[PDB]
């Protein structure tokens, strides 16, 4: 398989909890304070950002190709120009 199923990501998201940045003494409501977070924000399952960048790149190329040739294109039989080119 090796397919990132909804079920696995949700389990990773649920299990995770940062012990720090959880102020149990008073009401703080981070994102109302003008201070940085105690720990850097990281994804649940994926850790290295390089791989995430690559996956984003392949997804973007996928989408752009699908837009470029989704309909399929008619091109002249004798010559080789596109009869319905979209810019």
């Amino acid at each position: 398989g090796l397919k990132l199923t909804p079920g696995l990501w949700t389990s990773a998201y649920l299990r995770k909890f940062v012990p720090e940045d959880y102020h149990a003494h008073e009401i703080r409501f981070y994102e109302d304070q003008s201070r940085p977070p105690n720990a850097e924000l990281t994804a649940c399952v994926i850790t290295q950002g390089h791989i995430l960048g690559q996956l984003q790149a392949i997804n973007k190329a996928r989408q752009e190709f699908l837009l470029r040739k989704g309909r399929g294109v008619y091109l002249d039989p004798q010559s080789g120009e596109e009869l319905n080119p979209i810019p």
């Binding site: 392949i58 190329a61 989408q63 699908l66 837009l67 989704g70 309909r71 399929g72």
Partner: protein
């Protein structure tokens, strides 16, 4: 990478193609980026009419018949099967008519009309204020009683000679030596004088060339056919209506050209030594409709392409829902 297939079999209803892929070492294969490249020949059938209304004799009244002839059996004890009536026009002016035919040009040795093309149907006297008087010899050309009667509307007869004539080549020319047969244009000469003419002085008054043509109606049909017998008098009034338009082409997003969800004919993306079909092409999911909805969803990004949807099926909104507000016909319109 281009990829010429390894094996191809062109069965009766399918065109199977098989490939072989290469290991993705330090690389991985974006499959959805793949796209085919087809080149072939298409025949759209005899029911391809990319236009409304006829293309031949569009101006002709829809009941007007060509200048044709028919034969009446007149059954009886003494049958007379040589009636051979005619109905038509004679518009080619001439000075006189003789055995040769209509006279067109005098040089005397007058030149008589060539039977292959003349009298050209196009050419007719252009005068309503003519009042020429004297003897108005006239000529024309009509259709023989072998060609099927059809209305002028949408009537075609392929040209047989460079000069515009339409006569067929008679395949019969018997000779008294055995030998071989010969081809002659199938054209004749019929003469008419007048109903009240007295037997004493009968002279030609209307020449009329008669021939057979490959009459056909490529873009029309018959809506009123009085009598069953071909080439009858009542049949002169048969009506014609143009063939219905019928545009043929490919489908929206080349639907149907692949074999998605075909259990009998599926594909496999398995390894050379795996025997595990990675393409579970079953009928549970309707791939083409999934594609259609996916493309529709992708409109968000592609809201700029105004011709993004120049192929999707649509209808004229006014045809489906009709708004009848009458016609501004206050005045008359005279002829």
């Amino acid at each position: 990478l281009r990829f010429v297939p390894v094996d191809r079999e062109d069965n009766t209803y399918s065109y199977k193609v098989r490939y072989t892929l290469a290991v993705g070492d330090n690389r991985v294969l974006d499959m959805a980026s793949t796209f085919f490249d087809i080149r072939g020949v298409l025949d759209r059938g005899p029911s391809f009419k990319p236009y409304s209304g006829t293309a031949y004799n569009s101006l002709a009244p829809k009941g007007a018949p060509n200048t044709s002839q028919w034969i009446v059996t007149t059954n009886g004890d003494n049958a007379v099967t040589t009636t051979t009536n005619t109905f038509g026009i004679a518009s080619m002016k001439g000075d006189n008519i003789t055995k040769e035919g209509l006279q067109i040009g005098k040089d005397e040795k007058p030149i008589y009309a060539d039977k292959t093309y003349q009298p050209e149907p196009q050419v007719g006297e252009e005068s309503w204020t003519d009042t020429d008087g004297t003897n108005e010899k006239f000529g024309g050309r009509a259709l023989k009683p072998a060609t099927n009667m059809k209305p002028c509307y949408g009537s075609f007869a392929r040209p047989t000679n460079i000069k515009g004539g339409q006569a067929k080549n008679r395949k019969v020319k018997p000779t008294t030596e055995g030998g071989v047969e010969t081809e002659e244009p199938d054209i004749d000469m019929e003469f008419f004088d007048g109903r009240d003419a007295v037997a004493g002085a009968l002279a030609p008054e209307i020449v009329l060339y008669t021939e057979n043509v490959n009459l056909e109606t490529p873009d029309s049909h018959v809506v009123y056919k009085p009598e069953t017998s071909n080439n009858s008098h009542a049949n002169l009034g048969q009506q014609a209506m143009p063939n219905r338009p019928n545009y043929i082409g490919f489908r929206d997003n080349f639907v149907g050209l692949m074999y998605y969800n075909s259990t009998g004919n599926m594909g496999v993306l398995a390894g050379q030594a795996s025997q595990l079909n990675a393409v579970v092409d079953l009928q549970d999911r309707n791939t083409e409709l999934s594609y259609q909805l996916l493309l529709d969803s992708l409109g968000d990004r592609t809201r700029y392409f105004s011709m993004w949807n120049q192929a999707v099926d649509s209808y004229d909104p006014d045809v489906r829902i009709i708004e009848n507000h009458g016609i501004e016909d206050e005045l008359p319109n005279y002829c």
